[PDB]
Amino acid sequence: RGSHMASTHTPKWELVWEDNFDGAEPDTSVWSRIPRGKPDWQNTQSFDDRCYEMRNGLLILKGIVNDNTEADAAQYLTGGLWTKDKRAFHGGRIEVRARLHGAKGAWPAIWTLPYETDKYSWPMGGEVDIMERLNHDSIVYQTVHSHYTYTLGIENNPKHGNTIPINPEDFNVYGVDFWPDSLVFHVNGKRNFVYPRIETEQEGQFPFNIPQYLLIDMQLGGSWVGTVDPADLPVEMEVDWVRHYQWK
């Protein structure tokens, strides 16, 4: 350009955006607290300050026993942030570094949904689970959901999810790479599994190459994780950073 060339280089992973959770609070131009909703994951989501902490340059999202008598009160309250309406991810590599804590009924998640919420439905628009950790497991699930996996029921051809062990007491790096023909899931730089775009008679098998928003949120209870043991509360997940790369 201006002073030096088509800067011709071997393409590589380039850091295009990061959040190191440096401030007194989540950057309000990127993050919002997740509101209450009906699905098992969104049951507990709360604006309560007791669900959120910045500590030691770490983001802290907590699951706690609720003390609301009100007849329409969640038994448990969880903290979550999302980039909905604030930051879109256009494929590339999304990585989150986080430390988890065992608790019966806890299933903290890191995941993405279509950014364009007035343009895509669930599950036809797709869902990418970068991390789900159940209970006290020393493994995490990485998973995709779509029209194809969920509405048509085709979960195993190709395999829509896989588990991989973690260091459960340590920080681990949860990652997904978006390509035109495939998603590739990583924990600490180890490949978990590939979700391929296949030739198929049906539709909705690979809706993922669309702008994404990122959700990071504590979750308590549901049919998948099983019952909560309040004795294991309060519980936290600690987030060191989010990094977004592009191959260029």
Numbering used by the authors: -6 to 241
Authors' description from the paper:
Here we describe the discovery and characterisation of endo-acting glycoside hydrolases expressed by mucin-degrading members of the HGM that are able to cleave the O-glycan chains of a range of different animal and human mucins. These O-glycanases display endo-β1,4-galactosidase activity and specifically target the polyLacNAc structures that comprise the main backbone of many mucin glycan chains. Overall these data reveal that the nine GH16 enzymes analysed are endo acting β1,4-galactosidases that display a preference for polyLacNAc structures found in mucins and other similar glycans such as KS.
The apo structures of BACCAC_02680, BACCAC_02680E143Q, BACCAC_03717 and Amuc_0724 were obtained to 2.0, 2.1, 2.1 and 2.7 Å, respectively. BF4060 and BACCAC_02680E143Q have four fingers and BACCAC_03717 and Amuc_0724 have five out of six possible fingers that have been observed previously in other GH16 structures. In contrast, BACCAC_03717 and Amuc_0724 both possess a finger 2 (in addition to 1, 3, 5 and 6) and this has a more variable topology than the other fingers. BF4060, BACCAC_02680 and BACCAC_03717 also displayed some very weak activity against laminarin.
